[PDB]
Design a protein around this nucleic acid. Structure first.
Ligand SMILES: [Mg+2]
Ligand SMILES: [Mg+2]
Ligand SMILES: [Mg+2]
Ligand SMILES: [Mg+2]
Ligand SMILES: [Mg+2]
Ligand SMILES: [Mg+2]
Ligand SMILES: [Mg+2]
Ligand SMILES: [Mg+2]
Ligand SMILES: [Mg+2]
Ligand SMILES: [Mg+2]
Ligand SMILES: [Mg+2]
Ligand SMILES: [Mg+2]
Ligand SMILES: [Mg+2]
Ligand SMILES: [Mg+2]
Ligand SMILES: [Mg+2]
Ligand SMILES: [Mg+2]
Ligand SMILES: [Mg+2]
Ligand SMILES: [Mg+2]
Ligand SMILES: [Mg+2]
Ligand SMILES: [Mg+2]
Ligand SMILES: [Mg+2]
Ligand SMILES: [Mg+2]
Ligand SMILES: [Mg+2]
Ligand SMILES: [Mg+2]
Ligand SMILES: [Mg+2]
Ligand SMILES: [Mg+2]
Ligand SMILES: [Mg+2]
Ligand SMILES: [Mg+2]
Ligand SMILES: [Mg+2]
Ligand SMILES: [Mg+2]
Ligand SMILES: [Mg+2]
Ligand SMILES: [Mg+2]
Ligand SMILES: [Mg+2]
Ligand SMILES: [Mg+2]
Ligand SMILES: [Mg+2]
Ligand SMILES: [Mg+2]
Ligand SMILES: [Mg+2]
Ligand SMILES: [Mg+2]
Ligand SMILES: [Mg+2]
Ligand SMILES: [Mg+2]
Ligand SMILES: [Mg+2]
Ligand SMILES: [Mg+2]
Ligand SMILES: [Mg+2]
Ligand SMILES: [Mg+2]
Ligand SMILES: [Mg+2]
Ligand SMILES: [Mg+2]
Ligand SMILES: [Mg+2]
Ligand SMILES: [Mg+2]
Ligand SMILES: [Mg+2]
Ligand SMILES: [Mg+2]
Ligand SMILES: [Mg+2]
Ligand SMILES: [Mg+2]
Ligand SMILES: [Mg+2]
Ligand SMILES: [Mg+2]
Ligand SMILES: [Mg+2]
Ligand SMILES: [Mg+2]
Ligand SMILES: [Mg+2]
Ligand SMILES: [Mg+2]
Ligand SMILES: [Mg+2]
Ligand SMILES: [Mg+2]
Ligand SMILES: [Mg+2]
Ligand SMILES: [Mg+2]
Ligand SMILES: [Mg+2]
Ligand SMILES: [Mg+2]
Ligand SMILES: [Mg+2]
Ligand SMILES: [Mg+2]
Ligand SMILES: [Mg+2]
Ligand SMILES: [Mg+2]
Ligand SMILES: [Mg+2]
Ligand SMILES: [Mg+2]
Ligand SMILES: [Mg+2]
Ligand SMILES: [Mg+2]
Ligand SMILES: [Mg+2]
Ligand SMILES: [Mg+2]
Ligand SMILES: [Mg+2]
Ligand SMILES: [Mg+2]
Ligand SMILES: [Mg+2]
Ligand SMILES: [Mg+2]
Ligand SMILES: [Mg+2]
Ligand SMILES: [Mg+2]
Ligand SMILES: [Mg+2]
Ligand SMILES: [Mg+2]
Ligand SMILES: [Mg+2]
Lengths: 127, 205, 260
RNA sequence: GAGCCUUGAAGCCUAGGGCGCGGGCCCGGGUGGAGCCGCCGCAGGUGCAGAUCUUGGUGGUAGUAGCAAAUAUUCAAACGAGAACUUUGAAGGCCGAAGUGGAGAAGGGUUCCAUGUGAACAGCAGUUGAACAUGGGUCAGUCGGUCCUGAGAGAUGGGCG
RNA sequence: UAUAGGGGCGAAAGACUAAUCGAACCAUCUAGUAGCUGGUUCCCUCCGAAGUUUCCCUCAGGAUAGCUGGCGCUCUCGCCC
RNA sequence: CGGCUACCCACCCGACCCGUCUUGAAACACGGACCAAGGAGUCUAACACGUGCGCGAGUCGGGGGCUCGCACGAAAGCCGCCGUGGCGCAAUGAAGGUGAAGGCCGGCGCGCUCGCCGGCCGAGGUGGGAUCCCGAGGCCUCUCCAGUCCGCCGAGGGGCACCACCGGCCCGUCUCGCCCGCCGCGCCGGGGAGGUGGAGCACGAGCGCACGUGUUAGGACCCGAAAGAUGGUGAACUAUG
RNA sequence: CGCGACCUCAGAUCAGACGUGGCGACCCGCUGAAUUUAAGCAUAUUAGUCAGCGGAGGAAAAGAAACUAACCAGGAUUCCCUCAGUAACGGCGAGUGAACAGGGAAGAGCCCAGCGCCGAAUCCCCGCCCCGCGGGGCGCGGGACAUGUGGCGUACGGAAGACCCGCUCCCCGGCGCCGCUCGUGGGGGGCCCAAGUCCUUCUGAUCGAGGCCCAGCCCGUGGACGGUGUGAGGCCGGUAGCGGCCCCCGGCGCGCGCCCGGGUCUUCCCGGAGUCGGGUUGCUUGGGAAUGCAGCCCAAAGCGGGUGGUAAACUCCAUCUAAGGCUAAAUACCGGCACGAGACCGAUAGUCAACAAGUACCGUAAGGGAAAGUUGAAAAGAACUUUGAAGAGAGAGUUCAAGAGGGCGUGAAACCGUUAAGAGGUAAACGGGUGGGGUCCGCGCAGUCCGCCCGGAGGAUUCAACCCGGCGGCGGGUCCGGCCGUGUCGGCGGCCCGGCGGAUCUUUCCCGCCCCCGGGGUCGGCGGGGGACCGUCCCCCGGACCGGCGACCGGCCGCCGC
RNA sequence: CGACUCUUAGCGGUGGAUCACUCGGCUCGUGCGUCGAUGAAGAACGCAGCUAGCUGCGAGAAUUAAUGUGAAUUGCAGGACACAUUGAUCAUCGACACUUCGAACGCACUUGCGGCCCCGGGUUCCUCCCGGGGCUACGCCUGUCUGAGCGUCGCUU
């Protein structure tokens, strides 16, 4: 139950801060859980996403065991795009299909210096 | 406009009252503000008690209220001199100084003096250095409590006399009749005209 | 509303200009010019005799009735047929007025709390509250009040030591002190008979706090227990005691209907 | 109410089945796509035929009145899906120098000009236009403002407030 | 370029003063006032009028009695008067 | 085969279009072309009365203080050496002021249209008056004795509420009268008996909360004027320099 | 005549510094109506308010009595409840309308002119060093203010001076640093529990069902959000004296600067003027024989002046010291800055403005001022074919749906088109009564009734009748076993190792004092402490009473399932 | 029989009611309490690769620097994709910068007319010559400089 007098239970204010949060908060909102073997290996529940991961879909019309690479991230649309997930139009042109990143399981990361630092902050805080 | 047997109404509403209505809605918020102000005062002072200055013993001034007794304002510099202490030193000690107050009553004079002697007895002070002109040991474990509540020595203490038992005597129950008040009242009303007729009888030679 | 719907300026037209005698906005070009101005029956006028922020919201009750209602609610919480007739689950629960040990109020973890309720068999009642926490029906979903959730057992205690941290987020539960009672917690919805769970020191402190009929209450100054209207009140017992049935006329039971 | 529902709630329609004396309600059928009700209490901005009511919409009147002030058009051809109106030719006319001419002041603000479209606008139509869309156009020592004072207006000094 | 609203101007019509003038226009006081017109939204049950006295710068209105309804209360019945 | 139905049609009889002002409406009286949505006795203060609840000669915390900073907590709880205060418990006078106990018996002073003393009881009495109590007598299968038990009672007793009247008491005035008191002997107090004015007393019933109705002030059921004041904007039409 | 000194003055693009303009919700100063009310309307009321003008800050204003009172007296200002709808004002009509006592919240007092004492002991400007940073403050020489009056000592509560006695010898500001510190200083960012496990629906599932005796998992986290719907665990966050980094801030310790107060006694000093007040006239007030304010005129005093509520005189008493000034708090706040909530409205509502809203637009201008939310989960927005000059269409395709096709959710009524049925001279429509047809429902269509008991034809089971064994419950009794319950006494037991009440008492007691003659004396009084007495609830056994929803056991009666 | 008219009902159209949703209002309360000559509020004009509004900015114009953040903005191209350099975007924002009008300030407003001082080029220089910079409003205070007065006064002719 909410105990701060400085955070809102209010539906209007929460939806407004959600749909108008800037990009460096939209990164935190578009966050994905890690697979259970990788959370065993790294001791961390969730991470922000980027351009270069290896991604499996857990629910949708496109489900199960299809570990592909992300290519674009519209933070404006709260949508990532996956390389295997396609659909043709009428005119035979393929187009990526929108997947919200809560329905996304990360199987491999892209390792980088800031990702090592974020991962170490997660492990140090989970303690 | 009126009706059957009903009381004459003269309400005061012809003035445009709906503009200037100040309404108590911030009353719980003011109660919380004033609690936080008092707790902030208690933490901001020190060992000094809350409602810090001591208050005298003072009788009301109206044939209606003179039986009672009231926590007054200050100690009436004659009384504070009989206490044997200087003026602003009393303001630093925590003794209220009100120089306009006069003392006609030797009884309330001595009662204020007794209250001063009791406060000077209960006083525990701390100088800065180790000179310790006024002080002592580990002074009652920081006097075992830091802060007091609702007046220092409970300034009301409305004193109650008993007049327990006595044997009825004579003279009184043959003497103290109703007619004493009426004869004294007529004496007070006619105190002047009797003196004027005395001066007339002296003039008529 | 607190502000005018009279932001518009307005005049009437009169007996000429056939339409009406409502005030009208004056202007041109913009197609509000000539519509209905302030009033009730118009578009964008003030509501009739509008709400004002000095309405008499709060109401005062006498303190003796405030205490009387607490005594009546606690007395209604003691009878088993009342509290089952509200909707709790006391079918497999031990005694009515539950009173656990003082080891309870020193809890720190909530798993011990769930274990305590499961062994006291009120967990069926908690399971009902889990079963019924549906979404609100109505227009109230917009204004921050979305979960209908029924009230469960209220745990009453004194000398707070950490029982609030333990019992706090079990859903539907009520945690509530002795020296600060609530009618809004002891009878939610204005119906008497909410199930309650007590504690040893609390359940001993009750008779200090309200007294018996023989001695006055010690903690509350001027307050006695209430007067009692009918002393023994089993009406079947009274009517079938022999002192009444000595002095009854007769059972007259012939119907004597209409004769044609 | 261990209420009801994506196995379909609210709302809407219903030559369907009923209940109540009624206020109204219950079910069936079809649409419909995500919330809804019964009961005990409680609190209201709480129930429509009207107020020459307000706002929004649509009828009858009706394919009717009406597209008539200033004489007036006709033929052939072209581009075009399409020509009583566009353009060219020919013919016949009008304005007739106090003009339906040639240029300006105030006002308008891109309407000026070319190209392309003809959906809406031009009260019929249009291949056309001042419509829409794209892209262009206003060059000054000697033309005028700038300078002068006029009728006046207005500031400091002063006075009043 | 001058004159501005009880003000201006008028060869004088009470004309003109931005389609308004026997007192312009705009906003506010303002939801001004009205014994005077118009309307005043669900059902059923029960009871059910008055248009008369007196007084009022009262005669289209109100107060007063009278008429009505509701709330009751105090008694009376049931078992030769 | 049965079926009421807001389906449709036939036929007989009844059948004027609604709302309101009005003595009178179908009116040649006014408003209404049709449809959907909005649209009008609300809220506060104050008073009166009825109703429900709690406490009761009291009652009320509505203003403050007390609890750890916890969603619901702008809640709830407590104060009582916080009752200050409101309303009531005592009225009456313009005011100075004054301010509600009598009854029954014994005795005395001339028991004199008069006062004092002693004892006891205690809000007087009359007529009605729900109820209650007592009760002659009355009735229950052989004749005697029996108890509860049964029920009607003529009549009698005490008598609630309330009604009607008389008597009593307080205060203001008016009239007629004599006596007492003495922080001081006076244009000083106190007293008696009648007839009157009073929103009085004559064993107190209020206070708080809530609901209902009515009345009043508020924009107050909703809309409606010709006006008035304050402060500003206009001589591009027109008037005249 | 010149020069010098001032005094009055001007000038400057002199050196340096300052004011203007805005917002105006609250505050301050002035000015100032009228609608309305009184059923008319002149005073009154509306109101010293709307409008106007000038100012100000985070608050402002007020403020340390020229006071309240009249008795056992209080004591600056502010704000609340009361006072009180009262005293009072009023064509004594409508109406208007205080204040001191009382209880609270907050607590705070001071300085200067005058008077006199100190040899101008004072301040500003310029110039050089002094010092350390993020950045400016003490000291040394010369130009001024100023003797028509800087500074110190000084304020009506008395003050000063000089003896005498008695002590005391100081504090504020600047700098480095340690833990601090009431939410666990303030701000800024980044992070912190646990299932997307299994079947099953579906367009998609956050649906439904399930998880051992450890209750599948976490809970100081089950608020709320978004994600193809309705989530404690998929994600942000929520919880926590949860942890880390960065900044600034309020209360300890080295340097610089400043530093004799109290009591008695003696002498001396001691106050604000065109101001109060009076007359008169206007405004305002509840203020009446003038509360306050202002104009004009008259205009003082020193045991004075003002106030003491009915004008004036004489008199006594009380209280205060005006015409100079400063100051936090409690308090108001619809503007602003963020912020949190709601028995509030849900697009004709709520601000006029949910959207390119003070926008489009109207008027020359003052100014007036709108309409307008919704595809779908995802644009996947209809490829391609094929008529038509194109709009438009028919096939095809997208998706669960085009019955969602770009103002596109749901799509009502008025109205219109078409189909299906019926009908037609008294305009149509209605009520009562039927009849005919139609849509549709039910019924099974001369086969529709069911349930119990009793008498007959079959098998298959095992009660029951009777007893044994066992559990649980009913109903009563000795109130047995005890228990508690109701009353009355005994023990006062806990009275001091008991709660509380009492304007019962106890000076035979104790402490601070006062009284009488350093002590004693009840000679008496007050404040404070104990303890005898009554009034209730805590025990003991003994006896009275009842087994009452106060419940257990034994035996009895009588059921029960196995 | 048809046409017309009427009433029902199915379907279709016009129409945009009801219902459901809500980045919006309204009310209450807490915390804070801040503009301007060092040029405010307001207004005008301008600015994107494709650009009209809204929004955000000022000739450095859809933002510059710095701190935090850590791989994007997005309708479409491109461009830096660099990150074992400095590191995209977004927020914070304390350093820079801030066109013209506006209390508006050189005098007025018609973008007009000036006047000094200083610096670069001119005739290598003043005499109404180009570019750039600075200064040039009113009122008032403290001090400086200049000087008016048969105002008062001295010493002198
Ligand atoms: Mg909200
Ligand atoms: Mg009436
Ligand atoms: Mg009156
Ligand atoms: Mg008014
Ligand atoms: Mg208004
Ligand atoms: Mg208005
Ligand atoms: Mg509105
Ligand atoms: Mg609804
Ligand atoms: Mg939807
Ligand atoms: Mg319902
Ligand atoms: Mg319903
Ligand atoms: Mg509502
Ligand atoms: Mg309404
Ligand atoms: Mg209607
Ligand atoms: Mg009607
Ligand atoms: Mg109409
Ligand atoms: Mg209309
Ligand atoms: Mg029409
Ligand atoms: Mg014709
Ligand atoms: Mg025609
Ligand atoms: Mg023509
Ligand atoms: Mg051709
Ligand atoms: Mg041709
Ligand atoms: Mg033609
Ligand atoms: Mg001609
Ligand atoms: Mg011409
Ligand atoms: Mg046309
Ligand atoms: Mg062309
Ligand atoms: Mg052209
Ligand atoms: Mg165009
Ligand atoms: Mg040339
Ligand atoms: Mg020329
Ligand atoms: Mg002038
Ligand atoms: Mg001037
Ligand atoms: Mg006028
Ligand atoms: Mg005209
Ligand atoms: Mg009205
Ligand atoms: Mg009006
Ligand atoms: Mg009459
Ligand atoms: Mg009656
Ligand atoms: Mg009439
Ligand atoms: Mg008539
Ligand atoms: Mg009629
Ligand atoms: Mg009519
Ligand atoms: Mg009509
Ligand atoms: Mg409606
Ligand atoms: Mg009552
Ligand atoms: Mg009292
Ligand atoms: Mg008038
Ligand atoms: Mg006028
Ligand atoms: Mg004027
Ligand atoms: Mg002109
Ligand atoms: Mg009138
Ligand atoms: Mg009039
Ligand atoms: Mg006035
Ligand atoms: Mg104003
Ligand atoms: Mg200003
Ligand atoms: Mg400010
Ligand atoms: Mg003073
Ligand atoms: Mg009163
Ligand atoms: Mg007044
Ligand atoms: Mg969700
Ligand atoms: Mg969620
Ligand atoms: Mg998480
Ligand atoms: Mg007056
Ligand atoms: Mg004096
Ligand atoms: Mg005097
Ligand atoms: Mg005097
Ligand atoms: Mg003063
Ligand atoms: Mg002063
Ligand atoms: Mg203050
Ligand atoms: Mg809508
Ligand atoms: Mg609107
Ligand atoms: Mg979508
Ligand atoms: Mg569907
Ligand atoms: Mg739809
Ligand atoms: Mg749709
Ligand atoms: Mg037909
Ligand atoms: Mg349809
Ligand atoms: Mg619309
Ligand atoms: Mg950069
Ligand atoms: Mg200027
Ligand atoms: Mg320059």
């Amino acid at each position: 139950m909410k105990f701060n007098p400085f955070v809102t239970s209010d539906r209007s204010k929460n939806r407004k801060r959600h749909f108008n949060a800037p990009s460096h908060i939209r990164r935190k909102i578009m966050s994905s859980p890690l697979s259970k073997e990788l959370r065993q290996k790294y001791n961390v529940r969730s991470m922000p996403i980027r351009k270069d991961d290896e991604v499996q879909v857990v629910r949708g019309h496109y489900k199960g065991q299809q570990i592909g690479k992300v290519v674009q991230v519209y933070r404006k649309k709260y949508v990532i795009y996956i390389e295997r997930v396609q659909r043709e139009k009428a005119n035979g042109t393929t187009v990526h299909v929108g997947i919200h990143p809560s329905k996304v399981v990360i199987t491999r990361l892209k390792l980088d210096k800031d990702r090592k630092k974020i991962l170490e902050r997660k492990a140090k805080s989970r303690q | 406009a009126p009706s059957r047997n009903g009381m004459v109404l003269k309400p005061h509403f012809h003035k445009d009252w709906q503009r200037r209505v100040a309404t108590w809605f911030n009353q719980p918020a003011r109660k919380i503000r004033r609690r936080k102000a008092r707790q902030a005062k208690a933490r901001r002072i020190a060992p000094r008690p809350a409602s810090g200055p001591i208050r005298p013993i003072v009788r009301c001034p109206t044939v209606r209220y003179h039986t009672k007794v009231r926590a007054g304002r200050g100690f009436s510099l004659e009384e504070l001199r009989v206490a044997g202490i200087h003026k602003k030193v009393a303001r630093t000690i925590g003794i209220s100084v009100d120089p306009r107050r006069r003392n006609k009553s030797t009884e309330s004079l001595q009662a204020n003096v007794q209250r001063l002697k009791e406060y000077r007895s209960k006083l525990i002070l701390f100088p800065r250095k180790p000179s310790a002109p006024k002080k002592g040991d580990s002074s009652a474990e920081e006097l075992k409590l830091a802060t007091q509540l609702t007046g220092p020595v409970m300034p009301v203490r409305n004193v109650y006399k008993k007049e327990k038992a006595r044997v009825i005597t004579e003279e009184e129950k043959n003497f103290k009749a109703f007619a004493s008040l009426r004869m004294a009242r007529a004496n007070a009303r006619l105190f002047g005209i009797r003196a004027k007729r005395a001066k007339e009888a002296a003039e008529q030679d | 509303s607190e502000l005018a719907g009279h932001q518009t300026s307005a005049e009437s037209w009169g007996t000429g200009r056939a339409v009406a005698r409502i005030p009208r906005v004056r202007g041109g070009g913009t197609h509000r010019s000539g519509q209905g101005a302030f009033g009730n029956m118009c578009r964008g006028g003030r509501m009739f005799a509008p709400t004002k922020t000095w309405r008499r919201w709060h109401r005062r009750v006498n303190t003796t009735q405030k205490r009387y209602a607490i005594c009546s609610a606690l007395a209604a919480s003691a009878l088993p047929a009342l509290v089952m007739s509200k909707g709790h689950r006391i079918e497999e629960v031990p005694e009515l007025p539950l009173v656990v040990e003082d080891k309870v109020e020193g809890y720190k973890k909530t798993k011990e709390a769930v274990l305590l309720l499961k062994k006291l068999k009120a967990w069926n009642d908690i399971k009902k509250v889990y079963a019924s926490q549906r979404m609100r029906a109505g227009k109230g979903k917009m204004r921050n009040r979305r979960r209908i959730q029924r009230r469960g057992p209220c745990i009453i205690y004194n000398e707070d030591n950490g029982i609030i941290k333990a019992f706090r987020n079990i859903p539907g539960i009520t945690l509530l002190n002795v020296s600060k009672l609530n009618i809004l917690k002891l009878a939610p919805g204005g119906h008497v008979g909410r199930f309650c769970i007590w504690t040893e020191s609390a359940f001993r402190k009750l008779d200090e706090l309200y007294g018996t009929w023989r001695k006055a209450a010690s903690l509350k100054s001027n307050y006695n227990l209430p007067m009692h209207k009918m002393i023994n009140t089993d009406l079947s017992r009274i009517l079938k005691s022999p002192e009444i049935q000595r002095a009854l006329r007769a059972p007259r039971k012939k119907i004597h209907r209409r004769v044609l």
